[PDB]
Each structure stands twice: as structure tokens, then as C-alpha cells.
């Protein structure tokens, strides 16, 4: 079934990343300043599905940020969400840059990676 199976796992991953990002970007969080102190590491090259290893190794720091992201208006399930992400990556599946990334940049980078691979599969 892999023709639309791989495309669908990538779309599920994309929606999870996008939901986290929208939640951060839309609603006013009093903890935003603390969320922005969190340091994420970025792959040097992320072009193929193999490079999703580089995502898995930052899931522990991501889960922590997700605790900070819940509010009165943005609701989430950090543990379930991280588990789904780990599943999809481990199925569809590393050297970093010197530059650290914020959660916002981290999410945007991985969202764009997904969108490129998904444009390939259409």
C-alpha cells in the first residue's frame, strides 16, 4: 500500500508539527519567553527520509517544550503526540550545525522538510 502509505505518514507528521506551531503562534502564552530559551539542534542536511533520525534525537527536548505550550486556549497531549511522532519517524526512517534553533525555527525547518518530500510524492 506504500504509494499512499508513505505519503500519508508524512502528512500525519506534517499536521502534528503544524498543530504545535499554530498553537504557539496564535495564542498569547505567558510562558512564551521561557519556551524560547529552549535550545534545539538542527541537521546539517535534511533532504531524504533518512535524515529524520535527526528529528528523533530531539524528541526529548521537544516533549518538554510541549508541556509549556498548553494554556487555557491551546490544549494538547504532549506524551501521545510525541509517541505518534516517534512512531512515524521510526517507520519512515546524523550531523548537526553549530547553530542552535528556537522551537519556532525547529518546527518551521521540519515542516518545510515534510512539505518538500510531500511535493515529491504528488
Amino acid at each position, epitope marked *: 500500500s506504500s504509494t499512499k502509505k508513505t505519503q500519508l505518514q508524512l502528512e500525519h507528521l506534517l499536521l502534528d508539527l503544524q498543530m504545535i506551531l499554530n498553537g504557539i503562534n496564535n495564542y498569547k502564552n*505567558p*510562558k*512564551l*519567553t*521561557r519556551m524560547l*530559551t*529552549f*535550545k*534545539f539542534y538542527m541537521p546539517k542536511k535534511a533532504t531524504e527520509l533518512k535524515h529524520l533520525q535527526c528529528l528523533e534525537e530531539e524528541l526529548k*527536548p521537544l516533549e*518538554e*517544550v510541549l508541556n509549556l505550550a498548553q494554556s487555557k486556549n491551546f490544549h494538547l497531549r504532549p506524551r501521545d503526540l510525541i509517541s505518534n511522532i516517534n512512531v512515524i519517524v521510526l517507520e519512515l526512517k546524523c550531523e548537526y550545525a*553549530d*547553530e*542552535t534553533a528556537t522551537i519556532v525555527e525547529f518546527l518551521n525547518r521540519w515542516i518545510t522538510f515534510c512539505q518538500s518530500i510531500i511535493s515529491t510524492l504528488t
Partner: antibody
Amino acid sequence: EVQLQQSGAELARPGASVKLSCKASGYTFTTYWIQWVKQRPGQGLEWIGAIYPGDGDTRYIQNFKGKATLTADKSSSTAYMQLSSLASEDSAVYYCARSLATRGFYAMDYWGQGTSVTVSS
Amino acid sequence: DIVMTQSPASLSMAIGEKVTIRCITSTDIDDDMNWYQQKPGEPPKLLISEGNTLRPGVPSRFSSSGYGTDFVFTIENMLSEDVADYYCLQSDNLPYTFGGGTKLEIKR
């Protein structure tokens, strides 16, 4: 095990600068924020700012922007705080201390022993 | 910023009595409260971290409660080893900020 050793007591004349140090052992010096805290004699604790040594990024409370300058040497596992334009209300004990988890701001568990700065003619 | 008002500034308690210190936050910190103990000439020691988490090695008669803006630190029964200053620290947003502290002395 995890240890933070601060430099010694300093005396400085009003207007000079001083550079305190904090040498860290027992953990990955690069993935933990290090916080700096001022304590005037007989008074309360006072948050100054923080540095992530992995890349030199810094945070400051507003009215210490310019007074304090945080730096780090990753080779030596050492952090530094420059204080500039010293007045008397800068006479205080300054601690460094490590956030209790990686990659992010947290409260501090491992503390230096403190460095006392006196600012007098 | 978020200010934290710690109260009382001073407290004296007979041995084995229960001790209560309060921190009130100028905004909603969602349980991001921490409690430190400082004895003279020493650096402050983290007693309780956010989520009412007792630190490893800390005596069990230390406890804390609170979610939102009103937080309480509790010693179940005063021992003389507990004479010290106690400070709370919010770790919810920047800037980090400390309460003004509490001087805890024993009665005799």
C-alpha cells in the same frame, strides 16, 4: 560530583570594571543554562541573567543590561560575568548556578560558593 | 515582570510546631514555584522544585502546595536545624524573580 567553583573576593574602585569567573565540572558544560544571582549584604536574592555556553546566547533582566556582560569559554568549561561602571550598590555576593535540566530555563540546583565584590574608594 | 510577595518576613516557631510560609504571584504561574533554604555563609539550597517536587535528599517534613497565584511552603514540625532564610523563586517566565525571603528562627 557536579561542581561550580567561583573566583575570589574582589575590591574595585567606583567606575572600574571587574570580571568574575565560574568553572564547572561533572556534567556536559554545553547543554545547560547557567544563571547569575546577586545578593546584597544582609538582603535578598536577585536574578541577573543567564548564558547558554553551547553558543553564547544570553538573557538579562532589563536594568542589568549594560551593567553585566555574560561570556563563556567552552574549552575550559568556564563562565564569566563582567560588571562595568561599578557603584556601591554593586557591592554584593554574586553566585553562578546551573539550571537543573538541559536546553532550557529551570530553577537552579548546583550553586557556586559565591564571590564577594566590594566597590569603594 | 511577575513579582512574588513572600510572607511573613520573619517567623519564630517552637520546636515541633508546624511552619507555613506563603508566596503570592502578581500573575498566573501555573505551579512554576520553587523553594530554597539558605544558611549563613552558604549558597541557597533548592528544597522544592516546580510541581511540588521534593528534591533528592531533602527531609520529608518539607512540602509545598499551590497552583495559580498562591503558594505555600510547609515544615511539618520545626527542628532547630531548620533555622535559616527561605526564598521562593518563580520559574514560569522571564525575568526569573525571587520572593523577598523569610527569616525562620526557633523559640525557646
